[PDB]
Symmetry: C12
Subunit: 108 residues, 12 copies
């Protein structure tokens, strides 16, 4: 299925980034400036993520994803929600790749 | 196994996404916007779950599933209930899958 | 005997869904909307369990369970009670099944 | 001894159900509705327990058990006493079962 | 000495019951109804206990035991005292039986 | 060993009873009735202890023992002292017994 | 040497009785009746220890101990002090004995 | 991949420096002077990071990174966001390095 | 060295007695009576310690020790200082004993 | 490569001095005298580090570090920031060195 | 180097003493009488310490040591300072002796 | 090693002394007298440290060292800084020493 993740080095790069940033948001509350920043960051990280994925997962991700509004600073809640979604989605994707590796390299 | 899960990678993917989002709802209370977003995510996530499930499990899931009304923003409580339901349903589903796998690996 | 649980995949599934939901009700209090929602879920979840059980256990479960009243929203308490009973009943059913399997595969 | 518990699967089911509900009573205080439901559950559960027990133990259990007064809702305390009793009685019963069983497995 | 405990399955049954009920009394305070109930329970459990014991221990137990008054509800303290007495007495009795088993089955 | 404990089962029995009751006195404060009952239990328990002890230990125990006056209800403190005394005396007694047993099992 | 503790069974007995009683005085405060009681127990317990000791240690212990005054109820403090001294003295005596035994059975 | 990180020693240095400083930001709130210094450190550190990275990753990092507004002192929050990002990006980068490396060491 | 502690059993007894009493001083504050008793115990205990020590260590201990002023009751603090000193002096003494002893047992 | 750290003894020395000092600033707040003192120590400590580094790392470190102003006492915060940066920078430098050594001694 | 500590049994004796007494000072605050006492003790312990040391360490110790004033009771702080100095000095000295023993007895 | 530490026993001695005194300063706040004494100890301890160090390390230490002015009593903060500095410098020094020792023991 590895046909799904075109650039894996890149997806565990960005996924690790977003995971880290979410762990930051939990730490302590943000101000308008920070929340704004993290929105921008989220848009860019999804751009870069679609690049490292096959059209299958690009479009699935697009279907699950809700872009943000720029006319308003999103809440610390919306930021937690938006990033947690991507963290779960990625962690389940790599669960797929690694379970495939273990079963197959077990036969072999 | 096929009679259960047509697309295993996809159902585990989406399942992890829902589990993580349930962990966020538990983390701290949401606002009007975030709980709205999570309502959407819940709807779309069921959409995407139906694809990787045989029609039996499609319809069983539907019988267990409770759509939200777009005429009111649901409470953090309803969101905890809706997401928790899919998390339990999914884990009992995959527990079935693994009992089947262990049966095969015991047979051969 | 084994003929008691006609569909084992399905009862471990639904059982896990009830287990999770009870854990949510314990988490923090629900509102009229949420607890109403779990009434619905409890009624249909029993339906779906009855599908996966032999006439013996269908009829026993029917004797032990007290359907909810549609005429009023049940308490956070009654929901814990109703879910807990099926959780204990199922966990004891599966304890019977697994001690039986260990007995047989201990024989052979 | 074997003659004591004629239906083992059923007495283990019912037992686990009773123990689980007792732990719910511990969780948080119940309302009049919940206390009523849990009383019923207690009565019906003794009904189902007598079935899987030899008349000897049927009658000993009945001598140790105390029906409730249907003219009044029992306290969360009376429910704790009654269920606690059946939980202890049951574990002390099966403890008999497995001490004899282990004696047999050591014998052969 | 096993000549002492005529019906052992029964004494570890009841002993386990009373132990459990005492663990309940410690949990949280009782009302008049519960304390009354637990008195009744104590009388019956001693009746059933004397049955499973040789005349030796029946009468020793009688000498150590103080029946309750029915003209008054005993305190949570008297109930703790009364049951703790029987729990200690039983646990020391089974200490006797099991130390005998280990020493003798060691020689043998 | 005989020169110490004429009836070992009985002295260990009663000893455990006293230890458990001391654990209850520690648990929470008693009332007029319960502390009265425990006074009785203490008297009777010494009665029963004398039987399983050689006359030497009968009289040594008596020299260490302090009867209560039936003209006043003793404090929870006096009860803690009286019961603690027998618990220590008994454990040092049985510690003597086990040093003797280990001597025999080392000899043969 | 070993001739110092004439009756070892008795001194480990009484020693354990003093150890327990000190642990009670620490538990919670005593009243005039209880602490009076421990005065009596301390005086006779020393008597009974003197029985089980060679002239050497009888006379040394007499030099170290300060009998109590019968003319006043001793403090919770003096009782802890008086009991603690015999506890340390005995524990050091038995440490000597056990290091001697290990030395001898190390020799042979 | 190897082509991705051209100067490994240098990118690891800079990374550890950034992670350490982020943990200082967590330690306690900073003053305007400290926030200014740490901003500078952030800018200079991205300068030094671009050097040890292939133009591919140079440009991806630049697309993900957000320069600060020198016309105002950023919050302790913006500093937490920016450094947190580079820490996640870096660990997800080197995670790529060692997953490929381990693949090679398993191959040969 | 061996020449240093002429009576080892006795110095170990006295030491354990002193250490135990110091821990009582720690337990809770003493009264004038207890402080007086414990002073006496301190004086008498140094008397008994000098006996089991060679004149060398007899005199070194006397040079390090400070008699108390019998014209006034010493604080719980002075008692902590004096006993604490003898406890440290004693452990540092026997530490000498066993370091030399272990040297011998490694030699042969 | 190894030619980067000209004097390794000296840089682990000075590095440990900075590590400890940062741990003190965290311990409890400093005064104008102390924090002035750490300004001096930071400036000279960088000097002494530059001695033990190849031209490469001297110049890089110079680019990353921001000397302090002699015209004002720096905050407890700036001191933590300034020390933390060198702590991370050094720890990353030595992580590079040790992974290189393990690589070489893994080769041979 | 053992030429340095002339009487080792004595230095670990006194060192252990002073260590213990310092652990006492930390426990709870002293009164004028106790602090005075512990000063006296410190002077004497240094006298006895110089005896068990070669002139080298006698004079080094003298150079590091600050005698106390007798015209004033030193603070609990000065007493902690004075004793901690000696505890550190001694522990470093014995670190020297024991590291010498291990390296040499390793060659040998 | 000689090029580093001319007198190893002495530098480790004094180092441990300084470490212990730093532990006391941390323990609890000092007075005018104690902090004065520790100033002296710090000066003298550097005096004594210079002896066991090659002239290189003498002068490096001096470049890192900051004397106190005898015209003012330094704060507990300055003392924490001054002592912490020597503790870090010393540990990085001895860490260098042990890397050298392990090099020798790996070579031979």
């Amino acid at each position: 299925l590895t046909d799904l993740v075109e650039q894996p080095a890149k997806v565990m790069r960005i996924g690790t980034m977003i995971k880290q940033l979410l762990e930051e948001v939990r730490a302590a509350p943000l101000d308008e400036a920070s929340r704004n920043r993290l929105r921008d960051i989220h848009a860019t990280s999804i751009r870069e993520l679609e690049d490292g994925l096959a059209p299958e997962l690009r479009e699935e991700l697009d279907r699950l994803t809700l872009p943000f509004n720029e006319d308003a600073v999103p809440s610390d809640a919306e930021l937690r929600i938006a990033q947690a979604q991507l963290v779960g989605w990625l962690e389940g994707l790599f669960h797929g790749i690694q379970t495939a590796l273990f079963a197959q390299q077990m036969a072999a």
